[PDB]
Amino acid sequence: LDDIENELSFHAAIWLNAYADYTMFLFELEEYNDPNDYLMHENFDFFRGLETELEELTETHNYIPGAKDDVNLRGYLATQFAWGKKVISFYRHPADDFKCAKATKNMLGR
Amino acid sequence: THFFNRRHSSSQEFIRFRTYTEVLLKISAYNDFFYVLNNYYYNQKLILK
Amino acid sequence: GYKIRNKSIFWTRAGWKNNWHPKNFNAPRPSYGEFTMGIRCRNDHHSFLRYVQTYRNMSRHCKQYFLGDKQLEETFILGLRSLFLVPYDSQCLTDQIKHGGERRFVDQLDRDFELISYNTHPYQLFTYTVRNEHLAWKNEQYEKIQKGEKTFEQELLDYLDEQVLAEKAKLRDGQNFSIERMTEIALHVFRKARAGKVRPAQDVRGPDGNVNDFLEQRRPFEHPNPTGVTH
Amino acid sequence: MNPIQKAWLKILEPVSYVINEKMAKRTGIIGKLGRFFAIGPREYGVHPINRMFIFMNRKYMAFQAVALHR
Amino acid sequence: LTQYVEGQIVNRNQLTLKKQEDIEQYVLKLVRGYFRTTNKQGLNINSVLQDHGLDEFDSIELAMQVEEDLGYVISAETIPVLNKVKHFVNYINHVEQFKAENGKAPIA
Amino acid sequence: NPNTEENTIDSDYLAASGTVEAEKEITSIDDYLGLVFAIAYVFGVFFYVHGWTSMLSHAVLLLSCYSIIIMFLFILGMPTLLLYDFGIFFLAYLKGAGK
Amino acid sequence: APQNLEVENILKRYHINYTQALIDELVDWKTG
Amino acid sequence: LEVENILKRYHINYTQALIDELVDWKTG
Amino acid sequence: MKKPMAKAYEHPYNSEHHPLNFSAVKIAETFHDFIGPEQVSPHYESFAMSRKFLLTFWGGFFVLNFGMATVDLNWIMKSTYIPWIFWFQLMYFYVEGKNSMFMPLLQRFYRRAAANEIFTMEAFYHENIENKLRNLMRITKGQLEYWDIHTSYGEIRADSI
Amino acid sequence: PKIVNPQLWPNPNKLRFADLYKYQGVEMKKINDSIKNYKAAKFYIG
Amino acid sequence: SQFVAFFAIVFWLFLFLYTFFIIEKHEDFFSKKREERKKKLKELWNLKN
Amino acid sequence: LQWGSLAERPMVDRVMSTSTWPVPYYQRLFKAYPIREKKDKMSLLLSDIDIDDTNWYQAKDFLRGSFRGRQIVDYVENNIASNTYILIQQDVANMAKAYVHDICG
Amino acid sequence: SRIINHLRGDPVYQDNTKDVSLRGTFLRGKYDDLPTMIFFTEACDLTANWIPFFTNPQYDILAHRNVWLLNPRNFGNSDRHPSFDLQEMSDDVMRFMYSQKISMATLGGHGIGGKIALAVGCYHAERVTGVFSIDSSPMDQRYHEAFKEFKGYVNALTEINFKTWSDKDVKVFLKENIKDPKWRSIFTNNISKNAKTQSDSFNFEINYLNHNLNFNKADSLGNWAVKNGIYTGRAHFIFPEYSRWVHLATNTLPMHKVCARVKGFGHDIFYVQGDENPLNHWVYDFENYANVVASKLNKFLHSYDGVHALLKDRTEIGNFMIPDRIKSRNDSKHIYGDYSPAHLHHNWRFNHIYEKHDELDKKLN
Ligand SMILES: CCCCCCCCCCCCCCCCCC(=O)OC[C@H](COP(=O)([O-])OCC(O)COP(=O)([O-])OC[C@@H](COC(=O)CCCCCCCCCCCCCCCCC)OC(=O)CCCCCCCCCCCCCCCCC)OC(=O)CCCCCCCCCCCCCCCCC
Ligand SMILES: CCCCCCCCCCCCCCCCCC(=O)OC[C@H](COP(=O)([O-])OCC(O)COP(=O)([O-])OC[C@@H](COC(=O)CCCCCCCCCCCCCCCCC)OC(=O)CCCCCCCCCCCCCCCCC)OC(=O)CCCCCCCCCCCCCCCCC
Ligand SMILES: CCCCCCCCCCCCCCCCCC(=O)OC[C@H](COP(=O)([O-])OCC(O)COP(=O)([O-])OC[C@@H](COC(=O)CCCCCCCCCCCCCCCCC)OC(=O)CCCCCCCCCCCCCCCCC)OC(=O)CCCCCCCCCCCCCCCCC
Ligand SMILES: CCCCCCCCCCCCCCCCCC(=O)OC[C@H](COP(=O)([O-])OCC[N+](C)(C)C)OC(=O)CCCCCCCCCCCCCCCCC
Ligand SMILES: COC1=C(OC)C(=O)C(C/C=C(\C)CC/C=C(\C)CC/C=C(\C)CC/C=C(\C)CC/C=C(\C)CC/C=C(\C)CC/C=C(/C)CCC=C(C)C)=C(C)C1=O
């Protein structure tokens, strides 16, 4: 009995910690209003950590927008009517080059 | 693009995984209200039933 | 609230939500031994071992500046794993990436480690800043306890413990003191305590209980408006 | 606030006593003159030229890091 | 030879096992000391690390700790094959046998 | 506000439409992106993009006259560097097997 | 207070979501 | 049908058996 | 309570005013320090609409000032005729003619429509994220139902005996 | 240095209104960070 | 027309004729790691995240 | 320390202001942000992340602050046969069978 | 019982437009002293239909303010007067606030009730903290198809003579003439029997309303006259995406035309994302529409309602200084500078909170 008494206690402590996460977010969200009427650097202060992730993209020269985002929803909204509709491939760096070249018995590598 | 995706690209039919910054902010950047709410939950339910 | 109405929002020329192999003209084509004279290719089978060594490097070179903080080392490991587990958990089919997703992610992590070896990675500087603010707040609580004083967090817990007893002593018809009821009690105390930080409690009125604070106020003479005109 | 403004405050300390203590709290023309020329920290004392340099320096420096990191 | 421990510089000491019973005790203490290990008392010599909440990346952290305690230089090619408690015990034995026969550390 | 200011809307989406063309697999976009800017002042004369350089020198088309020379030299060097990448077998990459 | 328990138990058996406003209205409907 | 009307206002799906228990509760 | 650590590592080359790494966020802060904050007006009418007569005077004063200074204004007008005709006939279609002739060229419109939808999503950010959490709070509460059952097992065992 | 106050109006309480007194400090804090760069650059410039 | 034909021939068609990408791979450990990782998170997906 | 009345709300919520004619024409564009300080507030990125390793790690951190919590942590990490610390209850098998083994006496 | 308190009275036909008293339901808030909200239902609509909305624990509106579900004149329980002038109806609310000892209140409305709420802010801006209008706009709606149907239903409802017609005759007449299901149900619930089973009658004054709608002139409830002026305070507008009453194409412009502080779409004017459905006007019936309206209402009451015009939100109260116009203060020896505007207690006129806090302030010094 004491084995599940301590098992269900830690199990509740895990999901009570997740419950406190969601609760404290809705509590902090009360001070956030009109995301369209904040300055650029103040909106990034509410979402602390976004400036750091933005610095990692810049310092590693991942300046292709949405390359390290799994769902580049912004990339899809921008290309709804684009010719050759496509989004950037995942984790695509602007400096990598995987081009190959072969010589065959035929011309032009065929 | 980064500001919009990290705030609007999540959906309920998929799992949102925690990034490096979100790990450090939850564990080493919690405020006093978060610390109280967890110990308040633990004392009332796990200790005092 | 608001949902995207365009049903073709995730459509690409390569399929639905395809961000692993975008459709281009110069598509990959096979090679035949008998017919190939020479080839210039950079792909190899070294990405797996490079993935293992990059983790060991990024983990060990970052612990150099942790000063032996055991809780910070374990927190960093959880954060470092979230960065290495991206290709295994993402919606993107990382095994179907154009020219080898394994090589692409390995070269991406090497650029991160290069910044790590110089202690200039923005994740490192962010960890030092976050930990210093956390230790300053823990040292403040420790210095108040050594003085026998009560911390602000302990006074909230004791105040919340007594409000629960009061609310459950009147709750006799029902006997389910749910987590929903407990939360709104703590949140109401939090809102009054949060407003009390900018306006402390002077009298019985409590934290932020003075109406005179919200009458017309002016900037002090020694601190005028520095950025703009006042009139 | 900058050290040059603090250096002005040390020199103008006797002048600050004549205007702020004596003339400012009087009435009439002498009062209006003292309240107008009151000595202290500057309202709208920001220097836009100094701020213009800091902005262009940070913006041009981020360009240097991209162009040099090849 | 010195490292920071909770903000204090403490001299790091190295171990020399040279005995089968001591290697098993060290590996168990090593794996139990890891903060991600589950069911620490159910851990034995034939315990798969996967059954205790450990993945490929946790084996790297464990191998990194072996280099700290024993002074080994473990190559990246050896780490991904350490998936059980028995694998760590046999690898430590092979390294001690190699240095006792060849007089040098294995290739790193 | 990047969603209301049309100056950043135009520049952001335009830059994103260009960098996504790295999927066309021309070469490292980090390399030829600078050449695109110089080329944009050769053909951009048709759209008066050189207007902001009117007072920078005694020639309004100074940057355009240099860019056409840069465009010619670096395009001429692209096939030369490609043959260098092929190696000594470079003739087999072009014509194939002899007869 | 006692009439609140009578209605709440009735709504309990039908596993119907109930609010204090509904009970207050039903109780007021009984006295009215 | 006052019992039916208040239930309708709250948008609660009500069965016929529930209405009778409520009417009997008031009348009884 | 254990004595915590005194301090973490302090980077010798990173400060808040001179951050080591670069991003548009720090450039944004230096930019708004330069242009200053929003110049809020306390009046009931705008400055231009209250001084239309006075602004008309200074506007014409500087026109006459330039006109009185420029003795050769007719030479500037004639020297401007060819570029005025040339650049307007060349760029008419791409600016205005496209709206009723051969091709629309709706590239710039597509970017406005995408931004208008993103603006709307940001306006409903609170509602969308609150609906996402309600599903997570539903899952979290569903796991907490097991601890509520075990707490009553002691009462059941007491009454069962 | 001390600034003479005409005392024509009472200043707000620092505890009740803390934001009104912060700008002066963060401004000098920026200058102190710049001086650290000036001093550290003595050997490079020299 | 000459603007499109210039870049479509000098860069696009030219590099299509003399360069290519291979279809054969030398390593495929991402596919097998994702399958094993998916079995590890089966219980969480059952909660429908 | 003083807490005031639990029944009341902060005074900021109760203070109000009304308009009159004439009214300032100016429409505020952005919220003022003169000093870049947002201390004691948690990041809004921590919004809808699923359960993960950080949950059981932070649970142990807060549990180890109490006597009863220290007993739970040491027992779970030692005497519970689970391949993960992310405990998910989807069945009452271990709960019911642990009750039948105890209710016999 | 405790939360739901509706004062009982009898409608009195008044010859003087100033001797008109309004009745309605009062909903007590969760907390002791909260500002009050006065909400007006749609024309010929029950106040009780909004009780589950304002008493929903999920929305938790009563945690912010006390709610008065008030009926306008000639509607429900209030006094009857043939005039429907928005200025006269606005003065009714001011006498209600006085008799109830309310210094200032938030105003809300649905449909035509939104026009009434906004009119009170136009005529008494100093007594109104904000206006929250649901599916309405200060515009002439006499030619909207939705209003024409309502105008047609009221006209057909004048044919029924309660003395001669039986109950079965009325039920058949309503099902055949009133095709809209919601308007049909609302009009049935307005039918009530007087004491001593004298006869049946509508709760609203059908004669006075029909003449107002049938005349179709400036005083009609569908019309918004220029005489009403401009509202100077905080105003928030919310309406369905496909609403028959507010068309997103042009019906937003009247909001900028009448409300001086409205910034525009996405800030003070939102649309609820929904489908085309003629019943989407009644947002409280559908949870999708009600959830968005409640969240936007909580955001208005919490951060934007009763905040000075030149302040962004309530967060700027006490930390944002507003510029001052020169020669605007009586003190001649006044150094002009920026100031933070004064915000007063919500019922400072009828309580002594300023006198009590003055004495507590002297004990400190
Ligand atoms: C007016 C201006 C004029 C000029 C303008 C243009 C300027 C041109 C400059 C361009 C760039 C030049 C730089 C070249 C870099 C070379 C670097 C290097 O050395 O790397 C080695 C590299 C080869 O190595 P690899 O390919 O990487 O791999 C090798 C294999 O692994 C190896 O496999 P393997 O072992 O099987 O191979 C066997 C072996 C076999 O080789 C053989 O065939 C053997 C030959 C027989 C030898 C004799 C045997 C005698 C036996 C006698 C027996 C006696 C004994 C008898 C018995 C005695 C008994 C006792 O082959 C080799 O390995 C040898 C290859 C190396 C040859 C190097 C060729 C480059 C020389 C260039 C000379 C000029 C340079 C000037 C540059 C100055 C700056 C501009 O060489 C090259 O890559 C050459 C690339 C050249 C491509 C560029 C061409 C550009 C186009 C130019 C013409 C444009 C025409 C159109 C113009 C239109 C107007 C614009
Ligand atoms: C020694 C003797 C000589 C010296 C004697 C001393 C004389 C000193 C003269 C100075 C006079 C006192 C200075 C007071 C402020 C400046 C005057 C003024 O009107 O500002 C108020 C006016 C806004 O006042 P507000 O009513 O309080 O604003 C309410 C809303 O926020 C505003 O925006 P909203 O859209 O929400 O509301 C409607 C808005 C609608 O109006 C607008 O918003 C204008 C839309 C234009 C913006 C579109 C983007 C184009 C500009 C982009 C940036 C370009 C500059 C930066 C790039 C190059 C970098 C160098 O305002 C209006 O209703 C009409 C505005 C006034 C009528 C049109 C103004 C035309 C002349 C002023 C501009 C001059 C341009 C340069 C020509 C001079 C040659 C250098 O400011 C402006 O609109 C922009 C002008 C900024 C100042 C620059 C010019 C300074 C000198 C102007 C002197 C008078 C004109 C002389 C030339 C006339 C040629 C026809
Ligand atoms: C492959 C592309 C074409 C190449 C041909 C040569 C170049 C075209 C010259 C003539 C232009 C007329 C066609 C209008 C093209 C408009 C495209 C456009 O401007 O982009 C809008 C587009 C988005 O704007 P949009 O409003 O959505 O576009 C739709 C249009 O508004 C309108 O909406 P839409 O859906 O109707 O457009 C569909 C498109 C369909 O196009 C196709 O599908 C191509 C046809 C299939 C291939 C046929 C070519 C075969 C080539 C191989 C054979 C070559 C042999 C050579 C020798 C052998 C060498 C070995 O256009 C057509 O339908 C063409 C039919 C023409 C109607 C003719 C009716 C009779 C007219 C009689 C009077 C003519 C008076 C004309 C006056 C003089 C001209 C102004 O932007 C982009 O796509 C950006 C990416 C660029 C795409 C690739 C480059 C294509 C050229 C774009 C211009 C440069 C953009 C890049 C720089 C941007 C600034 C930095
Ligand atoms: C003026 C400010 C600065 C501006 C700088 C330039 C901005 C450029 C903005 C992006 C435009 C780039 C156009 C690329 C092609 C886009 C269309 C496409 O992908 O084709 C799909 C097309 C279109 O298919 P689709 O399905 O997407 O659209 C079809 C159109 N409808 C829908 C109407 C039927 O499909 C093809 O397969 C055609 C392949 C032809 C490819 C021709 C490309 C030639 C140019 C590329 C190489 C240029 C190298 C230049 C670098 C120089 C370095 C020194
Ligand atoms: C190194 O890398 C680089 C950067 O860093 C990243 C850049 O930012 C940049 C961008 C450059 C900038 C943003 C700077 C732009 C500046 C420009 C265009 C011109 C600046 C001009 C001014 C500020 C005008 C200054 C006016 C004067 C000097 C004249 C009036 C002053 C007088 C007469 C003072 C007399 C001077 C002396 C006695 C000299 C002694 C020096 C002193 C500091 C003494 C000061 C004394 C007192 C009492 C204050 C580049 C190009 C770069 O290469």
From TrEMBL, chain D:
Source organism superkingdom: Eukaryota
Entry binding sites for ubiquinone-8: 57, 64
Protein name from the UniProt record: Transmembrane protein, putative
Organism phylogeny: Eukaryota, Sar, Alveolata, Ciliophora, Intramacronucleata
TrEMBL record, chain E:
Domain Carrier: 21-96
Residue span relative to the full protein: 45 to 152 of 152
Lineage: Eukaryota, Sar, Alveolata, Ciliophora, Intramacronucleata
Protein name per its UniProtKB record: Acyl carrier protein, putative
Automatic annotation (TrEMBL), chain L:
Name of the protein this chain belongs to: Uncharacterized protein
Lineage, top ranks: Eukaryota, Sar, Alveolata, Ciliophora, Intramacronucleata
From TrEMBL, chain M:
The UniProt record lists the keyword Zinc: no
GO molecular function, one term: carboxylic ester hydrolase activity
Occurrences of domain AB hydrolase-1 (ranges): 60-298
Keywords: Hydrolase
Family membership noted in the UniProt record: Belongs to the AB hydrolase superfamily.
Protein name (Swiss-Prot/TrEMBL): Alpha/beta hydrolase
Organism in which the protein naturally occurs: Tetrahymena thermophila (strain SB210)
Range of the intact protein held here: 94 to 458 of 460
